[PDB]
Scaffold this active site. Structure first.
Site: not given
Ligand SMILES: *[C@@H]1O[C@H](CO)[C@@H](O)[C@H](O)[C@H]1NC(C)=O
Ligand SMILES: *[C@@H]1O[C@H](CO)[C@@H](O)[C@H](O)[C@H]1NC(C)=O
Ligand SMILES: [Cl-]
Ligand SMILES: [Cl-]
Ligand SMILES: [Cl-]
Ligand SMILES: [Cl-]
Ligand SMILES: [Cl-]
Lengths: 95, 230
Positions: B1-2, B161-162, B175
């Site tokens: 995810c972002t 992101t994560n 990312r």
């Protein structure tokens, strides 16, 4: 327009056990069923499935009734165990 | 995810996210935008999967926007079995409840920061006024970190992101840096929903796991846009 998802209305004034059914009527139950099995397959390690009954127990007692009422109406509509509905709805809290 | 929340030079708030999920050639077919109706009105809008009742992405029109990213310190499932059974909330159920009930960006932030959770998460929230953007790094019991926009000091975007933002991103899954570079190269004066969407289209921000990209702005709720990927 192109590439956007389908758009659905969900009414919070309709009862929890009915408000998702209009949306569900747009999908093939066999498709959704296999999709649920997939996610549960490659996201829920087998040790989790072993105690899944326990997980259903705590949710029914410790999770708010709309959450559970909505999920059971989905499971009954798709011929899934309540356990599978809860699991797939808890399958995303992390990777 | 972002997830990205950002402010342009005039003070407008924009919010975008990619939802990544492994083995998701099936979830792409089950992605749907949902308008939740109260009293014959659109109360809030979200994006979800059929059969999933919570929301990882959504907006309360003219109030705020929310996205969540997964946070994993290991043993999630183990810790979430433990965390459930005390009246704590699922991550995406809290997002949905906040969209439904919270009266303001300020109120949503407090609820997302303080409500006990069954798992760790990142909550990214955008409002309608200058500086109204925040990354909330959640422990189950409460917030580990609150990270607002600070355009006064040149910090006009926040990328999540994560991983915890105060630690480096892992070299094998970074990312964050390409998103920061892409926002840097866009410039605060050229930030809008279109250029934010482009940032969220850059590899590896956009990758083979990406199910959908959403861009949104609470002040312009009619511009909510989700694009299913692949
Ligand atoms: C949703 O309901 C609202 C009010 O009932 C209506 O304005 C709108 O046309 C509906 N949208 C869809 C996609 O059904
Ligand atoms: C982005 O730009 C700022 C200055 O505007 C700079 O300090 C920072 O190092 C840049 N980050 C990246 C990843 O290029
Ligand atoms: Cl179908
Ligand atoms: Cl709700
Ligand atoms: Cl990060
Ligand atoms: Cl981290
Ligand atoms: Cl725009």
């Amino acid at each position: 327009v192109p590439g956007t998802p389908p758009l659905f209305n969900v009414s919070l004034d309709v009862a929890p056990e009915q408000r998702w059914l209009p949306m569900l009527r747009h999908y093939d139950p066999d498709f959704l069923r296999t999709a649920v099995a997939q996610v549960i397959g490659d996201r829920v390690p087998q040790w989790v499935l072993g105690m899944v009954g326990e997980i259903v127990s705590k949710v029914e007692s410790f999770l708010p009734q709309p959450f559970t009422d909505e999920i059971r109406s989905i499971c009954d509509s798709l011929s899934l165990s309540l356990a599978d509905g809860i699991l797939v709805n808890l399958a995303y809290e992390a990777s | 995810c972002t997830s990205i929340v950002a402010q342009d030079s005039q003070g407008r708030i924009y919010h975008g996210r990619n939802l990544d999920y492994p083995f998701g050639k099936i979830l792409r077919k089950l992605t749907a935008d949902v308008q939740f109706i109260k009293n014959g009105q659109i109360a809030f809008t979200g994006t979800t999967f059929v059969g999933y009742v919570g929301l990882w992405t959504g907006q309360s029109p003219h109030k705020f926007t929310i996205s969540g990213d997964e946070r994993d310190k290991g043993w999630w499932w183990e810790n979430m079995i433990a965390a459930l059974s005390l009246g704590h909330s699922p991550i995406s159920w809290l997002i949905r409840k906040t969209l439904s009930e919270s009266e303001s960006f300020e109120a949503a932030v407090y609820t997302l920061a303080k409500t006990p959770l069954i798992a760790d998460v990142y909550y990214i929230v955008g409002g309608t006024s200058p500086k109204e953007g925040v990354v909330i790094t959640r422990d189950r019991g409460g917030p580990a970190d609150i990270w607002p926009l600070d355009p006064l000091n040149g910090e006009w975007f926040r990328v999540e992101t994560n991983y915890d933002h105060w630690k480096p991103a892992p070299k094998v899954d970074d990312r964050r840096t390409p998103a920061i570079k892409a926002l840097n190269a866009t410039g605060q004066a050229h930030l809008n929903l279109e250029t934010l969407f482009q940032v969220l289209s850059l590899f590896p921000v956009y990758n083979s796991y990406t199910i959908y990209t959403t861009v949104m702005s609470a002040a312009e709720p009619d511009k909510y846009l989700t694009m299913i990927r692949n």
